[PDB]
Design a protein around this ligand. Sequence first.
Ligand SMILES: COc1cc2nccc(Oc3c(F)cc(NC(=O)c4cnccc4OC)cc3F)c2cc1OCCO
Ligand SMILES: COc1cc2nccc(Oc3c(F)cc(NC(=O)c4cnccc4OC)cc3F)c2cc1OCCO
Lengths: 287, 284
Amino acid sequence: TVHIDLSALNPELVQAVQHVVIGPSSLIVHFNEVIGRGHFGCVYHGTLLDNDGKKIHCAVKSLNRITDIGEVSQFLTEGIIMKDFSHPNVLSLLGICLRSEGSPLVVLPYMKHGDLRNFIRNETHNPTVKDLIGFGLQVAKGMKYLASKKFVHRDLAARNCMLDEKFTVKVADFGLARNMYDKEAKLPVKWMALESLQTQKFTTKSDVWSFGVLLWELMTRGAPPYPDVNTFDITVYLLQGRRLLQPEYCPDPLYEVMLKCWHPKAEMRPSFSELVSRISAIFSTFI
Amino acid sequence: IDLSALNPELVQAVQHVVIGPSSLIVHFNEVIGRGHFGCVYHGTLLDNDGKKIHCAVKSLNRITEVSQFLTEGIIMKDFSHPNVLSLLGICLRSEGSPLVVLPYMKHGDLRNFIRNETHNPTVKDLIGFGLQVAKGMKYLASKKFVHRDLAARNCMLDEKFTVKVADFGLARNMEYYSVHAKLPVKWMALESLQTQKFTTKSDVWSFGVLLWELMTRGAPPYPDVNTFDITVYLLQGRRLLQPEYCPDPLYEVMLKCWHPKAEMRPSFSELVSRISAIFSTFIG
Ligand SMILES: COc1cc2nccc(Oc3c(F)cc(NC(=O)c4cnccc4OC)cc3F)c2cc1OCCO
Ligand SMILES: COc1cc2nccc(Oc3c(F)cc(NC(=O)c4cnccc4OC)cc3F)c2cc1OCCO
């Protein structure tokens, strides 16, 4: 494991990071109880207790990329901004838990019904199209909040959208932004915009493109984007002006919005504020 | 790679499939298909009886995951049908990739065989080769095995000119995060092109194309249609045209396979019955 000398941090930084830190004594991880595994890593069940209060059911995950002392300080400063994020459609972290055993941990509020993609894909779950459009709105409202804070997600998808106990879609981040700037690599090319594939420039406009793909997933009940196209022919596909086709049970107004998101020029794409109003309309009209 | 790293109940349960390195000679000098079908070499499998067996060995260099591979080994090993290429065993080692071993199929793949201009099989032979595949897929279908990549290229011929349905196991590759192979889009079913979901009914669609390959002596499907515009083409209702030497009854079976509604497509048991009648109405 990675033995980090946690006493090497700047006292001023440490004192400015007191609200975001946890302290291993306050946080209980369940290494036996694995809730999921994927590209980023394993996620575990957790038990935090705030202000010597009741047990808070949370999800814990490690960041193995963080090795040296510098990479810790990097993430702590980022965590300050992440903690300040307060929105009903954004899954903000509770805090970071440093330890001398291995790499740092990040604690987030536990999400009962899990990720958005597996939810709609699940056979037992059978939500109507009314709900599927509703999920898209929450992401947009969620992304609108982040957009106002000048946040660039760089990996917006159904998989990175989580349902709580009240089936509330919250935008989650797995730190793709970090990995890119560290190692410069496996990137989500199908969710990436035409700029991102070539230039690797990421903005709100690239997230709008990614949001377009997210809407496609919802309407197809979590189908893999570009399912009749190779992963390494996506650049050519988009260069030739071909986009995703209209799903079977997808309103024309909603698909029209998807096409706006998938505009070759970046500035021509709509803002997240606009997507809230449009999808709100489509949510109301639909039977 | 450590061959006994994870759960040690597998190795006990998967004794039959696993084969010892001592009882397997790999002729690395003799290479099959001139390296067009990956790293496939000749081999000699020492049976516990005594006498040796001519086999073909392939190195699978797409593995770190390992659990999922051996799981399929149990399923593959416990297959046995005249028109299905059986898996002899997998040879694990302390170092190197896993080696899959199969019985040597003399005349190679079916696609190149019918295309081979030197060979001149009659239409009855071609319908004969098509029927064998249906009987092979009937067996696999009955044991709930979705082939996914069913095509002439994935069918093999022995010295008795017996068609065997072979699996290369590349269908388990189809990724979220990629770093800068081909999907069989022209063999894929309509719903498979939209969902990437494969069933026995999706294999029926692919089988329809396989028949079309046979009847055209291994022509390229949809030769004047783009890879990208292949889904729309099928949604428009367009299908492969009737080959020159394709009988009308056999072409109906092809169209029957390419029904947009998947449930409406015929089973492999149903297809065998149809083609048996067609095969028996030919002189030879
Ligand atoms: C059981 O359902 C699930 C419920 C879940 N509930 C809450 C959280 C989950 O996973 C996450 C996680 F552990 C970490 C992070 N964030 C980061 O790592 C991160 C890294 N760097 C910078 C900033 C970062 O964010 C602050 C995001 C997650 F969403 C869940 C996963 C589930 O499983 C999904 C698959 O089954
Ligand atoms: C000389 O003739 C030939 C004779 C041949 N005899 C036997 C096998 C051949 O090719 C195959 C091969 F090497 C590997 C596999 N199986 C797998 O890879 C696999 C991988 N993962 C999981 C499961 C898997 O299956 C169990 C299947 C094949 F059919 C032959 C090819 C020839 O040439 C073809 C061109 O003519």
